[PDB]
Amino acid sequence: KSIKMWGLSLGWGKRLKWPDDYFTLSAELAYQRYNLKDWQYFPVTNGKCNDLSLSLTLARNSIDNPIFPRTGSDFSLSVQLTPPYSLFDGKDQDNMNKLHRWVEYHKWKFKAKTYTPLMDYIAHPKCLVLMTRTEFGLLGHYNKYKKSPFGTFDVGGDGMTGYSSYATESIALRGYENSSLTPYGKEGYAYARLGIELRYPLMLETSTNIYVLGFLEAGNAWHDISKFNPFDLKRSAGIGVRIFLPMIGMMGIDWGYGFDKINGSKEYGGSQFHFILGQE
Amino acid sequence: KYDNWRARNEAFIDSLANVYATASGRGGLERIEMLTAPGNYIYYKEMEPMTDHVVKAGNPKYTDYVKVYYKGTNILGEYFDGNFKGDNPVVDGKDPSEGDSPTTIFQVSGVITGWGEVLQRMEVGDRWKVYIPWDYAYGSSGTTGILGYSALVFDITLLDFANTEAELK
Amino acid sequence: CDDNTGGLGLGMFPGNDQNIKGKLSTFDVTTESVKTGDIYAKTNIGYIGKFTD
Amino acid sequence: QTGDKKFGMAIPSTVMLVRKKFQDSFFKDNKLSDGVSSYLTSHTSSTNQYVFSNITKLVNACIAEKEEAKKNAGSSWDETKWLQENPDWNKVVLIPVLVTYDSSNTTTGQANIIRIQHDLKPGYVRLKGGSLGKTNPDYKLKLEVISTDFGL
Amino acid sequence: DATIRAFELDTIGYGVNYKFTIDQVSRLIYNVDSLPVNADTIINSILIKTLTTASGIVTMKDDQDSIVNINDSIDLTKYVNATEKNNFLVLKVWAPNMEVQNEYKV
Amino acid sequence: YAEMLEDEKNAVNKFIKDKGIRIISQDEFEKNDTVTNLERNEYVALSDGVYMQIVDRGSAENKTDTFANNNEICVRYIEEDIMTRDTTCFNVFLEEWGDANQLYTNPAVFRYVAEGSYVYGTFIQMDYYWASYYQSTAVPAGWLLALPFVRNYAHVRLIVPSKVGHSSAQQYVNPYYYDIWTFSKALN
Amino acid sequence: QNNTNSPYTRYGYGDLSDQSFGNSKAMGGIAFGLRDGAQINPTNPASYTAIDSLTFLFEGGVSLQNMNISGGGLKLNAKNASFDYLAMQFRLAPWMAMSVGLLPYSNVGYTVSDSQTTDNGLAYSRSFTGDGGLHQMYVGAGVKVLKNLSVGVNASYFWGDITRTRGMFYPGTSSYDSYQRKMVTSISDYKLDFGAQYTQALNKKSSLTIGAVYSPKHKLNNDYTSIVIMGASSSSYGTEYKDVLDATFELPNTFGVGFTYNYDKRLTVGADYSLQQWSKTNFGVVTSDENVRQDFNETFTYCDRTKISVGAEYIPNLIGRSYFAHIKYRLGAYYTTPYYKIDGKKASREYGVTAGFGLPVPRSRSILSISGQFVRVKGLETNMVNENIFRVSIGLTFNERWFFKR
């Protein structure tokens, strides 16, 4: 009893000249295969599934420092199709391990960040900055019944915990346990994540870099795309610190208090701790 | 509703304690010294004695068993537990919506200190209504169904007491 | 983050919402003893013995 | 129970309430409890009660039967005649039953019923209310119904 | 400052324990089921247990008030059938504040 | 192995070709009245891959007391393993084990449930051998497909693939062959 | 319950949110005649043509609130927080600009409960809740047809879901079935909005602008449904007896007009007026069940909404070296007759006073727009509640040099 996943991809990037010379376009083609028998945490239980996906991503990046940015912005707009076998191109638990020999979807994303200094900068370059985030996502379907069991969104907590699995996309939402808003049978087909942050660095050096922050997040996710509602969100707040190591990536500590309930239960709210590693 | 529960429960006990000391006819109250804390008192009210006594003179001991009809209520009169739910135990009850009450067996050393003190001074077939402080009830956090720091009021009928259950059940 | 507004609001809701009530009512049932008849037993246990009540 | 006898008869632990139309057909056809026509309950020794707690489906079934009869008869209906015939339309009987369960699905425990049959070991109990309740209201049970009133 | 009690005694016959009633109003202890005739050779040196109370300091009159040897064995043959020629094992139990005073006769 | 175990069809084909056995489609079985001829060793290809032969349709004089919902049915059988050709389970008398009185004295009995979908059945009494060996109360689903085609006191022979076998056949993916000497309506 | 707790939101589409961005939220909502080129303004599409040549503006916003709610001698307060806008804006030509953004239109939020006991001794509890709202996502453009005159349009996707429940629960009862009816209205259609602006060069240093805005009457694609749930509990889902209905929903004709005076780029003052023709809309449903029909006709009924607002901002001596000379100072006040009809008569009447700042980031052209607002809603009949609501409002107009080329 096990679950088998493997795949590969190839991509090609290019700097543009139309809006400005900061824009970069990227195109990528990917392949993946999932192999299973008597497995139970996915809706699929017995069989083998494939997917060919073509992605176009338009991005613009204008920040100064990767590790502690202080000016500029980082915008991304992405769309990811797989061919529509449900239409005339391909034409013709009850029968759910059926019809997903090939899975079908088209996934959309928008992702923007925006860093401003609040005390001049250049002078006393240690500075203090205000950040800002705004992420939206949709996993649409060509056919109402042949919705994809793979590639769905999973939200709540550190986000890193989801990379124990590779058939889903994990989204951090700080202050809410882990994978709390998207439990079994309520996989996310649309999401929204917003949130300010105010940050101050303690030390900036060649080997190690340190900063402390207070946040104000807000996010949600829906099992049904037709009920997407970016003004109905599970709010938060808190404080945290991060560390950059000479020979390792980030490690950091975040505390957050979840304010709203989830599915009528307050069990997942309240004080929570998150332990970030690598990089978000 | 349940605001400042401890202070008002203690005030209820103090009301009974000083009524016994100032009112005419003692306000109907009577009291017993408590052997686990000499100088403290438990307050009770005498009621209609039974008419089917099993003629067992004397009083129960600390380490022997007891058969009772009982009902437990809080200061506001709301139900906690017991064998009966009306204002009297039911035997040969005329009303077809209420059944005849069962009898329950207890060990005097296996119950709260208020019961353990008052049961050692009843004689078979007495009916008493008793008023116990939260110090000698479950106390502090309380059990299931108790809001903590609660003064319970019990209605007790002593039917029988014996050294073992097998000669009593 | 409050989620209650208490009870302020009823009195301006439409009539068919704020008129709904609950109720308890009771009705009388008679009972009597009846003979068993010729029941269909069909059990695998066989009963042997006697006792007096 | 009377007499405090050592080896006396016990109170039936499980009883079934069934519409009198199915009194003998239920056991002859080896049916299981229907939900809309029969119910099972255990004795509550802490209060000396058999309580069924929601028999709404049976009431709706009886109401639907009489309403359908009235709808089919139309203008030639007579309420008194139809209550004078079919006298066991609104009658139920209480029967001691022996109920047995399956043992599998044990760890994810469910305990399905697989056979209901007449209780044939010796046992009895004396219930309140009686035939005198046909005339004297002291000896008559009460049925309690709670509902939502829309005020229309 | 209480004087709660659970007074007990160990196996006289193999696996046989005898139950003691505790009359706190009249301040005395006894076993309802009398010991067998054989027992006067067994309780010649026997062990007391489960003499739990709010504060374990307990003494018996001897002139002196010597402390009980709760962990050690005792000769009880002097204290049998004490209702006439009355010769109870009479012992004193102290409250945790040493203010409240009590005696019990066995 | 995961998918390679579903090669049970190779073993069933081996078990078929090793003997004189002919296959009839259900659309032919239901049109030559209803019989699998025993001189020609016919078997019907039933639903879910069950192959079934009726040796005696049962109750030939009464013809009316067929099986139906809420019945309790007594089964006597001998079970043969397809992958290794071995008698694995039985509750019937044969001289080679005649003196083993525990094995064959009591039958297996099950309740038959036939509501609008999902026919299933539960053992009320398991035979000593099944009760000690397999220890599960769920009837092989392949048996229940045969009831609508037979009457009381019928004799049928079945080949049951893993998808509709019992709790061992479904895990170790093993088809089985049953020589059902008798289906009976339960008395007392 | 992410934008409101006012129990007036049990009627209609809730209460309409004003999509007033940072500068207008402090200036009382005078958004029709404004041409403040440093911040975004979706309320009049003709305003987009004021943006500086090389710039890209990205505005957002939060808001916190504390509603003091009073009625019948009872007093209570309730605190929520919201998300009020997000929008991008950029220039396509020396004479055209475009914007895309995400806005709220109306929200609902209420929980109002109750606990009772009958004379026969039965205790029972009721619970009337509500959740959801209507939202708007838009793409718009504005063009200069003459040196003084600009026109523009917003084309918007317009979707939402409003859910409203009634319950009847019996605490302490051993086993029973709870009754709950959940009426839901999903909507998914489009919305068109039109506007124009004209600027006049008074006295060589001042300027006066006038603006108007219009959106036509519309009928909405929808999925109105009447669910009644029976027997749900902490362990079971109960049964759902759904019921799908042919309801008709609409949006009214809306008109708005205003002006803004401006002097030496140091001072601006202005005032707006708007009217929405809600009482000339044909809401209705067709069904055989009178209870449902009566609810629809009593919950979706309206009166004409009107709004009057005035405001100003002042920026003193912006070239002197002192930070308080760079801060935009803002003030405003407004009056509204909400569209609520409860019983046959009009429900409420509301007032508001607002103030805020315009904090600029040094060595950048980003603006942080901390603002605050006191609003009082007075019930016009004795059985209805009064509200005193207070609200801070954070918002940041990012702004960076974007379309530059060598």
Residue numbers in the entry:
A (entry chain A): 590 to 681, 697 to 884
B (entry chain I): 28 to 196
C (entry chain G): 18 to 70
D (entry chain G): 386 to 537
E (entry chain H): 34 to 95, 98 to 141
F (entry chain J): 27 to 214
G (entry chain F): 23 to 428
Authors' text:
The β-barrel assembly machinery (BAM) complex is a conserved, multiprotein machine that mediates the folding and membrane insertion of newly synthesized β-barrel outer membrane (OM) proteins. Cryogenic electron microscopy (cryo-EM) structures of the BAM complexes from the gut commensal B. thetaiotaomicron and the oral pathogen Porphyromonas gingivalis are similar and reveal a 7-protein, ~325-kDa complex with most of its mass on the extracellular side. Remarkably, besides BamA and BamD subunits, Bacteroidetal BAM contains a 14-stranded integral OMP that is intimately associated with BamA. The remaining four components, named BamH–K, are all SLPs and form an extracellular dome-like structure over BamA that may provide additional functionality to enable the folding and assembly of the many β-barrel–SLP complexes that are a hallmark of the Bacteroidota.
To obtain more information on the relationship of the co-purified proteins with BtBamA, we collected single-particle cryo-EM data on a sample in DDM purified from ~10 l of B. thetaiotaomicron grown in rich medium. Maps to ~3.3 Å resolution were obtained that allowed confident manual docking of AF2 models and subsequent refinement. All the abundant (that is, visible as a clear band in sodium dodecyl sulfate-polyacrylamide gel electrophoresis (SDS-PAGE) after size exclusion chromatography) co-purified proteins except Bt0502 are present in the cryo-EM volumes, each with one copy to generate a large complex of ~325 kDa, which we term BtBAM. In striking difference to the BAM from Pseudomonadota, most of the BtBAM complex is extracellular owing to the four newly discovered SLPs. Further classification and refinement revealed the presence of two particle classes in the dataset. Class 1 lacks density for the periplasmic components but has good density for all extracellular proteins, whereas class 2 has modest resolution for BamA POTRA domains 4 and 5 and for part of BamD, but with poorly resolved extracellular areas. Given that models derived from buildable areas in both maps are very similar with only small (maximum ~1 Å for Cα atoms) rigid body movements of the extracellular domain, we present only one, the ‘hybrid’ structural model. The highly conserved N-terminus of BamH is wedged between two strands of the BamG barrel and interacts with the conserved BamG N-terminus, and the tri-acylated BamH lipid anchor is positioned at the BamAG interface. Together, BamG–K form a striking, half dome-shaped structure in the extracellular space, with its apex almost exactly above the lateral opening of BamA. A total of 17 glycosylation sites were observed in the cryo-EM density.
